[PDB]
Design a protein around this ligand. Structure first.
Ligand code: ZN
Ligand code: ZN
Ligand code: ZN
Lengths: 184, 220, 184
């Protein structure tokens, strides 16, 4: 398979940061409860620990963040016994810079930004799909772990070389993966 | 009557494993308990085979569960208990149960099919002429059930300042119909459900699911 | 389920005959080898052991014989360790009566007869089906243990009440049951 160098280095350095600079062990201790999923990490600690790592994460937030999630999962799994079904997420607070709403441009897509605003409306909470599992209606093959991103995406093609089905699938909600969701 | 009431406290005191399994597997356990209650009752009296062929079991008391705000992904397909205020009612509706279908090529009557709450019943083929369809419902020989739909809103006195009350839908069946008036305050024991056709948003927007509560008891 | 009284009594009495009247234990000892499937039993021993049982078997040969096969299977299984895949059969030799070919009539269908003749032609040997296993092509249900008798018989109806399929099936030869066959 093909691997990503930057993702691997970011994983290693973020594991080093979580293990060396410990408040985050104490927060992972709280992370056992079923109502907690997110770890909150101060960004000034990242700046002090490694300027290179901080710059890489800021310039590569979207690409790196899912791998930091896996590193956090491995950390909490090593420290405590938690079922593999649960997921975990990372958060950052103390950014030293601000950007106005109109200053947001297409060049900043995918990086980490901080803005200010006023709330006007909040929608109710709903569950959402993250990674789905589908069953092919022709050859009965099971396709697992299809990433949804930001739309209801079916598998690109049936994994059976002879079938080549791209239009008829069933969704098995029991095997699927969910996350809470709200719009503001 | 057609309904029986059981307390969770006594059930836990006598048989702990059933009480432990009750919250995380409500439908099948309720079906088994209904079968057991029907067997016991028919042992007590033999005439109900003429009067009532099924008996429902309802849970009365429980450890009080969180309000409408806290219901999230963790509570799906579980047993919950809520308190709220009724705002609307749909009346009484005849839902299908044990459906008989007439073939449209010949006139054979297909046997009874149990109507599950999740998906519609689609018969495969006519057993005699082997046709694939179409089929229609035999109105005269079908059995019907009572169905009602309710919207529940948080009590305005318990809402913290700075946020708004939130609402959820519930469904009442059989003896539970017309047990509440709009504007009243009720408490329900029910099942937090997703697995019903049409819950997934597909036409446009994010993949968002809609949740529905299926109730089995009412406490004023 | 519904049971047959005569079959049960014949099973019990034939097990008694095999256990009490022992040449047949010595033959079951030979029955271990993979090239042997049939037990040969003398009919005069049946006549001496129980006239009632002999008369019942003669008047009910077709109906009783498969159950005697099961009794023999249980006997050999108790006496020795043989895989359940193998089958076993019963044979009879010393009938005291003969019937001419033209004397065979419709009244004798299903009973045990003995005739004389001259061989004219022999066909080659082939495998044959006894009990099949089928897969429904619509609802993918598996139907096992369908008796073939003397024709290629599909399942009467799909065992799923809603499916009701009677025309489209696949045959899984791997799970099936065979027997050797020759025509003369
Ligand atoms: Zn396919
Ligand atoms: Zn028909
Ligand atoms: Zn079928």
């Amino acid at each position: 398979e093909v691997r990503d160098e930057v993702a691997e280095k970011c994983q290693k350095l973020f594991l080093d940061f979580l293990e060396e600079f410990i408040k985050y062990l104490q927060l992972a201790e709280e992370l056992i409860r079923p109502e907690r999923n997110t770890l909150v990490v101060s960004f000034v600690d990242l700046e002090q620990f490694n300027q290179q790592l901080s710059t890489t994460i800021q310039e590569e937030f979207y690409r790196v963040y899912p791998y930091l999630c896996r590193a956090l999962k491995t950390f909490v799994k090593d420290r405590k016994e938690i079922p593999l079904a649960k997921d975990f997420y990372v958060a950052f607070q103390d950014l030293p810079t601000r950007h106005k709403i109109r200053e947001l441009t297409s060049s900043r897509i995918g990086l980490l930004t901080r803005i200010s605003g006023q709330v006007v409306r909040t929608h109710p909470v709903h569950p959402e799909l993250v990674s789905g599992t589908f069953l092919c209606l022709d050859c009965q093959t099971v396709i697992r772990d299809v990433e949804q991103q930001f739309k209801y995406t079916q598998p690109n093609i049936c994994r059976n070389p002879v079938c080549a089905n791209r239009r008829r699938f069933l969704l098995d909600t029991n095997k699927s993966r969910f996350v809470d969701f709200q719009k503001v | 009557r057609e309904s029986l009431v059981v307390n969770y406290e006594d059930l836990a005191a006598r048989e702990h494993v059933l009480a432990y399994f009750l919250p995380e597997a409500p439908a099948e356990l309720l079906q088994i308990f209904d079968e057991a209650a029907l067997e016991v009752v028919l042992a007590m009296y033999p005439k109900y085979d003429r009067i009532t062929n099924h008996i429902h079991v309802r849970i009365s008391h429980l450890p009080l569960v969180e309000e409408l705000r806290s219901l999230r992904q963790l509570h799906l397909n579980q047993l919950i208990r809520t308190s709220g205020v009724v705002t609307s009612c749909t009346g009484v509706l005849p839902q299908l149960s044990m459906v008989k279908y007439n073939c449209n090529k010949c006139n054979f009557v297909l046997g009874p099919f149990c109507q599950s709450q999740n998906q519609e019943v689609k018969p495969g083929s006519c057993p005699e002429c082997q046709s694939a369809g179409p089929f229609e419902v035999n109105m005269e020989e079908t059995i019907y059930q009572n169905y009602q739909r309710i919207r529940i809103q948080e009590s305005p006195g318990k809402v913290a300042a700075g946020r708004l009350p939130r609402s959820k839908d519930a469904i009442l069946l059989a003896d539970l119909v017309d047990s509440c008036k709009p504007g009243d305050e009720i408490e329900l024991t029910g099942i937090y459900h997703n697995n019903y056709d049409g819950s997934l948003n597909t036409a446009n927007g994010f993949p968002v699911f809609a949740t529905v509560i299926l109730a089995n008891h009412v406490a004023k």
